[PDB]
Amino acid sequence: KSMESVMVKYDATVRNSINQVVQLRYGEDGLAGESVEFQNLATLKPSN
Amino acid sequence: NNELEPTPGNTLRQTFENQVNRILNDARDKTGSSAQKSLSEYNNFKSMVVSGAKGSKINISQVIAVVGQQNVEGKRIPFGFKHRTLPHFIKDDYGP
Amino acid sequence: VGIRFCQECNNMLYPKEDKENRILLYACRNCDYQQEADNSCIYVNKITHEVDELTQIIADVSQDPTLPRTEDHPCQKCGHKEAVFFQSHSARAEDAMRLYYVCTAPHCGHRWTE
Amino acid sequence: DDEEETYRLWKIRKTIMQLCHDRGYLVTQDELDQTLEEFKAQSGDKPSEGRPRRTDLTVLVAHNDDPTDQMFVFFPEEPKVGIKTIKVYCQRMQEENITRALIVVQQGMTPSAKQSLVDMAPKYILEQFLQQELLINITEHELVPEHVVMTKEEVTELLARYKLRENQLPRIQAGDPVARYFGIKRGQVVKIIRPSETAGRYITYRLVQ
Amino acid sequence: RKLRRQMDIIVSEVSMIRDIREREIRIYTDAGRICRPLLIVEKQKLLLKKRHIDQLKEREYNNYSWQDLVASGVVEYIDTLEEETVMLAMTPDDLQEKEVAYCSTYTHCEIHPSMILGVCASIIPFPDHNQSPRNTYQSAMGKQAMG
Amino acid sequence: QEKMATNTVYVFAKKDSKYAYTGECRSCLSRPTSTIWVSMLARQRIVATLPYIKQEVPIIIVFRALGFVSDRDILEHIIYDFEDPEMMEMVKPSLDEAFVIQEQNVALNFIGSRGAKPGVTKEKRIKYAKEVLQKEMLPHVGVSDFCETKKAYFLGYMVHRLLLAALGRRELDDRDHYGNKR
Amino acid sequence: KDILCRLEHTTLRKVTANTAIYYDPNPQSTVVAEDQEWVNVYYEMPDFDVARISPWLLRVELDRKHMTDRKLTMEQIAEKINAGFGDDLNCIFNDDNAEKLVLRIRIKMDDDVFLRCIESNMLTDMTLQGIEQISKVYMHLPQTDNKKKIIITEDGEFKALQEWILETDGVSLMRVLSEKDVDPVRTTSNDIVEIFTVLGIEAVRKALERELYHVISFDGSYVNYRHLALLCDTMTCRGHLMAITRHGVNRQDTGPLMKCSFEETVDVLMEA
Amino acid sequence: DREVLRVIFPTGDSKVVLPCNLLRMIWNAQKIFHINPRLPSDLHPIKVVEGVKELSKKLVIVNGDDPLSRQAQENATLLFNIHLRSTLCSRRMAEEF
Ligand SMILES: [Zn+2]
Ligand SMILES: [Zn+2]
């Protein structure tokens, strides 16, 4: 009931029913949560 | 004989219960590991657990070795009677 | 220490100070009757409760058939082998597992702790 | 006694210097970075019946754009501040023709003096700061992301780019501790830059209401 | 206790409890109290003997029954809060005999440990080899079994 | 139908309630159930919630209304051993709270003032409280006016059990103990 | 351990063995046996036995175990009592040599009644050490990398260090952040409203996100970040903590038909 | 990019959720085109850098030519671009893939 109206608009912005901006891009990256997978950066951990 | 030293931050009852629970959990885990090691390659319990279809290593341990400690509200079985669990046991009996 | 009662009316004594004289006395307000006090303490408060329970526990618990009993610890005065043991009941102490012992014989009311 | 009060005063002064630097006021590197021993030597160690009385501590700093716009920071002598004391500060403020100032209250302020503060708002703006709030810089906490006060031109560009009316933005209330730290007005828009574990970085815009 | 066991002027309905530490003695003739029969143990020996079993095995055409067993002082009714003062032995042949003794002051003995189950749970074969939730499911489903 | 047992004193402890300990005795002579409560207030003093009476009443006022003027007799019914100072220290504030009432008729008027109404006259006010204390207070102990002494003992036992609960000398009664049920 | 003792709330009751009120009319002719041996030291050149001094004596005993566990000083206790109450009590106290650790206190309300009230105030409220609303403080070395300090070495590697951390029962975040040698950057609490009132709204956003992630992933399950982020953003969008209840959701400026379908059906339409 | 990652990810947790699985994709390419790791490669190292640079322009989350839009696009695709550059390193391409 609290979230029922939150929705991705055609601006790719996330707005509620009053058009108030909740997120400027969905998920802060604009990607759907079903096509993503786990991966390794491979640059973070190594020694210099 | 009041020889048990209370762990910092924890009451004497808390550390006594912790030690007994530690001992019993170690026993149950050792017995379960032994039972799992004793399983043959033809055992259907192992064939079901290894493939992950249904059941688990604790299920095998309880079936073969030891059902284990029984807990009420995350604690060992309380004293519903005055100072004992059932009328068959003696008062002030903290044994397993 | 604790309550004392007036003789004239069986009511509480409570303390008053002899203003002209600097001696404490007990005076029951329901009458004139007075007592210069023996108790130079009027109020004491055992905040830490370090007290052992030997006075609260009593010899008749020796007759409880559901209590455990061992021959290991002998009584001091008679040395009868049988002695029933049980745990503390004080809610509020630095310890919670010490055993209170009572001599089991019908004619030796004697008690100890370990 | 006296050493602890000195330590508290040194922390408060350092936090106030960081405050002024973050607000865009000309603060020299030495004033930003002052060792405890240096502050102790400058202001004379023990405060109680000693050289750092509270009135010894007041700060005048100049803005980078214009040196005419100057901030005083006051450190009241009294555990609680009254209308009389605030009127004395305002009289001095008018005599020095300055427009902005802070007050560092040791315990708290009477509501009548708070109302006196807001009554002055179109003329002279005074901001209350409790002593404990200035004992640590909340901006350096790990939970607080980067805050940047936007100019009116930047706000206009933002609203033209996203075609947003001002009320459609996320909001931040004026009583927010970060909004108190940056001295942010009703109607201004803040820019928050925080790291994200999906994108890497994310910018949020809050309207101050 | 002697009068209750002799049924003389105290009905076996009546429960008597002595709380030694609190120095109280409570007697209940009240209705609604749940109770169960138990065998009396005197010293380390049951009061139930081979002659009682012989007479009960010849129960037919002997007018000797459970009421005659009660009147002999062999079995006793005990309710919930009298059990607090009762030392129960799970079985006679395995807790009355001398060992490195757990207890020697046993006062009562269960008839059979399987008497703790209800009507629907008494049809379960090997109920001690199962998980308790499954026993509950069977107890619930037995009321729906057709016959 | 399962229900709590009657005529037996129980002691419990509520979390948020103004009382640290609440002793009660659901009493039945075969009739609707006349529950007295005897409670100990938190930050300590003892008050009673009598049936058909508006508000709490101090214990000493009730005891004096029962006909026991003297503090010795009241504490002798409450405390069975005068050699224990902790019990005296626990009871003392309750005595001090009800000092302003010293006469039995004054106590009866005090109780009647908190009745279902104050009666029309001093005699009807005092009469209503006497009827409530003889008919509605502890009916299983007795109903004939001689039994007030026995009623006093039972009330003293209730208070004594509450004091025992307050001293930690006894364990609080378990409500799900199936022997406490009928 | 020093920080632990400085952080934990300790009342005078915890270190007090027992208390007794005596009648001790004259300074020198005391009721007690040992106090003659310091009463003489105090009254042979009497400190302020200049006005009259009251017949009623208050006498608190202090357990040595608790006294030395918390690194207390009887001089510290006397200073704190005298400062908290002013000059309206005279404090007489022993050197640590005395085996029986005594703090002899002397003063409309009657003398003993006021002195009993003093005792009942001191035991409960004296607040000897630490920060109140802090019941207990636990100290331990974390085994989990999320509580272990992880730093970058000179080779650019990630090295995990073990340092002592404290976990309190009860929350007062501001004064703990004020405390000497407490790390202000990383010190955090699990309370959301306390973080609000201390650090602001973005801090609540992040802390609420962390709490939700912890409570969801403690079971071992995994939930995508986007849903947690959306929940936190919706709760913190309007600038204050919008609880997901009838109050927080129906105080949004939405249509009355949306509100009547959640938890306040008739009242919403009546007000609209 | 390594410094940025070390700022973004303390504790050094390298597991990240990203759209397309580059290692699996490279392995797919290796198997589709029958690539022999035992033989020298014909891939010019300039083309690796140029292809990465041109691909990074075609992954648009925020569409626009304003500086604000450019900054938004960079913040949106920073992590994925860093990962893409790390995996499509010219040396890593020449040695492993
Ligand atoms: Zn008298
Ligand atoms: Zn003996």
UniProtKB/Swiss-Prot annotation, chain C:
SUPFAM superfamilies from the UniProt entry:
Zinc beta-ribbon
Which BP terms from GO are recorded?
maintenance of transcriptional fidelity during transcription elongation by RNA polymerase II; transcription by RNA polymerase II; transcription initiation at RNA polymerase II promoter; transcription-coupled nucleotide-excision repair
- The record lists Zn(2+) 1 as bound by 6, 9, 28, 31
Q: Where is the protein found, in the record's own terms?
A: Nucleus, Nucleolus
Which controlled-vocabulary keywords does the entry list?
A: Acetylation, DNA-directed RNA polymerase, Metal-binding, Nucleus, Transcription, Zinc, Zinc-finger
What would you give as a GO molecular function for this chain, any one? nucleic acid binding
Is-annotated flag, keyword rRNA-binding?
Answer: no
Q: Family assignment?
A: Belongs to the archaeal RpoM/eukaryotic RPA12/RPB9/RPC11 RNA polymerase family.
Main function: Core component of RNA polymerase II (Pol II), a DNA-dependent RNA polymerase which synthesizes mRNA precursors and many functional non-coding RNAs using the four ribonucleoside triphosphates as substrates. Pol II is the central component of the basal RNA polymerase II transcription machinery. It is composed of mobile elements that move relative to each other. POLR2I/RPB9 is part of the upper jaw surrounding the central large cleft and thought to grab the incoming DNA template.
Q: What is this protein called?
A: DNA-directed RNA polymerase II subunit RPB9
Species per Swiss-Prot/TrEMBL record? Homo sapiens (Human)
Swiss-Prot record, chain D:
Q: Which Gene3D superfamilies match?
A: RNA polymerase, Rpb5, N-terminal domain (3.40.1340.10), RPB5-like RNA polymerase subunit (3.90.940.20)
Q: List the disulfide bonds.
A: none
Single Gene Ontology MF annotation:
DNA-directed RNA polymerase activity
Enter cross-link residues for Glycyl lysine isopeptide (Lys-Gly) (interchain with G-Cter in SUMO2): 80
**Cited PROSITE patterns:** RNA_POL_H_23KD (PS01110)
Entry annotated with the keyword Metal-binding: no
Its GO CC terms are: cytosol; nucleoplasm; nucleus; RNA polymerase I complex; RNA polymerase II, core complex; RNA polymerase III complex; RPAP3/R2TP/prefoldin-like complex
GO terms for biological process? protein stabilization; transcription by RNA polymerase II; transcription elongation by RNA polymerase I; tRNA transcription by RNA polymerase III
Family membership: Belongs to the archaeal Rpo5/eukaryotic RPB5 RNA polymerase subunit family.
NCBIfam families the record matches: PRK09570.1 (NF007129)
Descriptive protein name: DNA-directed RNA polymerases I, II, and III subunit RPABC1
UniProt organism field: Homo sapiens
Q: What is the lineage of its organism?
A: Eukaryota, Metazoa, Chordata, Craniata, Vertebrata
Curated annotation (Swiss-Prot), chain F:
Q: Where in the cell is it found?
A: Nucleus
- Signal peptide location in the record? none
Record's family? Belongs to the RNA polymerase beta chain family.
Assembly and binders: Component of the RNA polymerase II (Pol II) core complex consisting of 12 subunits: a ten-subunit catalytic core composed of POLR2A/RPB1, POLR2B/RPB2, POLR2C/RPB3, POLR2I/RPB9, POLR2J/RPB11, POLR2E/RPABC1, POLR2F/RPABC2, POLR2H/RPABC3, POLR2K/RPABC4 and POLR2L/RPABC5 and a mobile stalk composed of two subunits POLR2D/RPB4 and POLR2G/RPB7, protruding from the core and functioning primarily in transcription initiation. Part of Pol II(G) complex, in which Pol II core associates with an additional subunit POLR2M; unlike conventional Pol II, Pol II(G) functions as a transcriptional repressor.
Q: What does this protein do?
A: Catalytic core component of RNA polymerase II (Pol II), a DNA-dependent RNA polymerase which synthesizes mRNA precursors and many functional non-coding RNAs using the four ribonucleoside triphosphates as substrates. Pol II-mediated transcription cycle proceeds through transcription initiation, transcription elongation and transcription termination stages.
Which protein is depicted?
DNA-directed RNA polymerase II subunit RPB2
**Which species?**
Homo sapiens (Human)
From Swiss-Prot, chain G:
Query: According to its UniProt record, how is this protein modified after translation?
Result: The tandem heptapeptide repeats in the C-terminal domain (CTD) can be highly phosphorylated. The phosphorylation activates Pol II. Phosphorylation occurs mainly at residues 'Ser-2' and 'Ser-5' of the heptapeptide repeat and is mediated, at least, by CDK7 and CDK9. POLR2A associated with DNA is specifically phosphorylated at 'Ser-5' of the CTD by CDK7, promoting transcription initiation by triggering dissociation from DNA. Phosphorylated at 'Ser-2', Ser-5' and 'Ser-7' of the CTD by CDK9 (P-TEFb complex), promoting transcription elongation.
- List residues binding DNA template strand: 246
Q: Where in the cell is it found?
A: Nucleus; Cytoplasm; Chromosome
Q: Where are the transmembrane segments?
A: none
**Residues given in the record as DNA nontemplate strand binding sites:** 251
Its quaternary organisation is: Component of the RNA polymerase II (Pol II) core complex consisting of 12 subunits: a ten-subunit catalytic core composed of POLR2A/RPB1, POLR2B/RPB2, POLR2C/RPB3, POLR2I/RPB9, POLR2J/RPB11, POLR2E/RPABC1, POLR2F/RPABC2, POLR2H/RPABC3, POLR2K/RPABC4 and POLR2L/RPABC5 and a mobile stalk composed of two subunits POLR2D/RPB4 and POLR2G/RPB7, protruding from the core and functioning primarily in transcription initiation. Part of Pol II(G) complex, in which Pol II core associates with an additional subunit POLR2M; unlike conventional Pol II, Pol II(G) functions as a transcriptional repressor.
What does the similarity note say? Belongs to the RNA polymerase beta' chain family.
Organism field = Homo sapiens (Human)
